Amino acid sequence: SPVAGQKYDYILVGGGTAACVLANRLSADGSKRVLVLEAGPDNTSRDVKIPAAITRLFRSPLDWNLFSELQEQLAERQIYMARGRLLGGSSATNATLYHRGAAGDYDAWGVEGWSSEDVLSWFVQAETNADFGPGAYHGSGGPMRVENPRYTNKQLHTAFFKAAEEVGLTPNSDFNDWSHDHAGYGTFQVMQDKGTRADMYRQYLKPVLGRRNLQVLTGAAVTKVNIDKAQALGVEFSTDGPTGERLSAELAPGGEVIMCAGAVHTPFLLKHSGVGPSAELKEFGIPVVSNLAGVGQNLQDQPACLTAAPVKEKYDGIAISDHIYNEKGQIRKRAIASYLLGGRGGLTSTGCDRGAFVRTAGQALPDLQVKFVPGMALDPDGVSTYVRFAKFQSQGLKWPSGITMQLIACRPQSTGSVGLKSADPFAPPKLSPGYLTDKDGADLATLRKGIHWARDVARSSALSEYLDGELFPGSGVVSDDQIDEYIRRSIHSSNAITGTCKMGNAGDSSSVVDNQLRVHGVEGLRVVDASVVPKIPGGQTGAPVVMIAERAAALLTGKATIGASAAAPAT
């Protein structure tokens, strides 16, 4: 009905992080008709704009509310896996931390044309940074906004740095500078513009909505790619939920469908389109279009656990929870005034503004990320405690002052899968994160050694000054066996999720897309989102997705090629 009689050069499945970048770049010269189909609503919520309102976005109508299959290895629990559902996708609901990982993460992909030297200029092209000018590792002029965090905690932020130094960690002045080793303690930069969330709807899509050649439809749930050698024709979707008419957006000749539904929903939709392992498609009577073993395999997510400690009575009031709420759960006037005048103070924080990367055991690259939060978790599940914090408003109760360190296996060895639990394209996917399944027990060992490292930091004189014991995991949890059980019972997502449509070299049989991001076995179909990441980089995955989308757009528009290897000579 909104697509009746129209033909599109590009159809983007999803209106999230990658899709916003692509919609901007592919509509720029005016020559191409671009359609965006997003299942969620428009990006208008105040809870998206204010960073500290991330607490309110978990388990909300702006989230997919996805739960994993029962995980036998995690005390038989379903794990919540947050995912944004609106224009800007997870960039609209994330913690805003700006991380690229290390040069070695991209070299470890081993994919032709996607070395660290190849991807660096695409990170730089996306970027405008308030604290780093143009240089080898930073750009100025690109649509993203990055800045140093605008919340300062007078006592706890430098206490964390001093404690990390007391345990023998060195400072890292810029976690995105590839001329330094990745390990160390330091500030985490944020995807914010003077304390306002700088999501990719705000930075890339919203500014170009006036373009006549760009059509964005919200409340548009894609059901499958229409495929006719298999050739993408366009995409089926409903604007009225499960009961709605199935509409079809049609490609113009030479048009492509670009999958941008993310690492959960892209492999899910491909399987619904007949692209995936033939056994999984036959199970639900889906005709096999491209028998592609890797679709929904290689799910990589960074699992997390935490330690938390209360401050001494004399330091009551020094935590970010005290800067946001008063003793009755009322949002503090100082926080509101600082946010609106100046774009500073506790509402500019998603909780962590600094942390560390750490080698627990002599690895080539850090296996552990540490997020320092100058507030105390009341649950060993950090995501649960954020939901508690949002619900705490106006309850007439005092949130106890303290600190938290979240421990993340940032380069995990475990993998999971995404598949189908039914033939209905409106049903949730069959989601298995696979945390702690790697054969050596490396991910469990990382998080166990993480807890020991967080304990050493909390015991150090610089932080010890403020603290009065330990809440989580607490006094009862000391032996390796007690720590491992705490981790199995409390492990939660740090919200990465990559690799389910993995890019690979010619000859890599686990590949779903080639180095041109083309889906094997289908013409005119590409994936441009976190699905394609071959091996997860250390740190949060949003900046890498924008880099991939920026480079994909340049390839599609003819401004760049990927893979510059000299042809072997004629003999």
Ligand SMILES: Cc1cc2nc3c(=O)[nH]c(=O)nc-3n(C[C@H](O)[C@H](O)[C@H](O)COP(=O)(O)OP(=O)(O)OC[C@H]3O[C@@H](n4cnc5c(N)ncnc54)[C@H](O)[C@@H]3O)c2cc1C
């Ligand atoms: C809670 C949370 C915290 C995070 N913290 C950080 C962090 O601090 N820093 C950072 O860099 N990264 C962070 N990340 C990760 C980062 O946000 C993601 O890796 C990145 O945004 C993914 O981009 P994408 O384009 O692959 O997918 P998304 O941005 O998730 O976009 C996919 C889009 O597809 C839509 N969609 C799904 N199915 C359909 C359908 N059938 N039809 C139509 N549309 C559909 C979704 O609604 C969504 O809008 C976080 C993630 C979350 C969820």
Ligand SMILES: CCCCCCCCCCCCCCCCCC(=O)O
């Ligand atoms: C508990 C989690 C934090 C909640 C934050 C909500 C703040 C509500 C107080 C009133 C906000 C007034 C300022 C309005 C700003 C709206 C967003 C923006 O335009 O940047």
Ligand SMILES: CCCCCCCCCCCCCCCCCC(=O)O
């Ligand atoms: C915005 C302020 C919130 C204050 C909450 C109190 C402190 C709790 C810290 C929880 C520790 C782990 C952090 C969980 C982070 C959830 C979001 C994310 O995954 O980045």
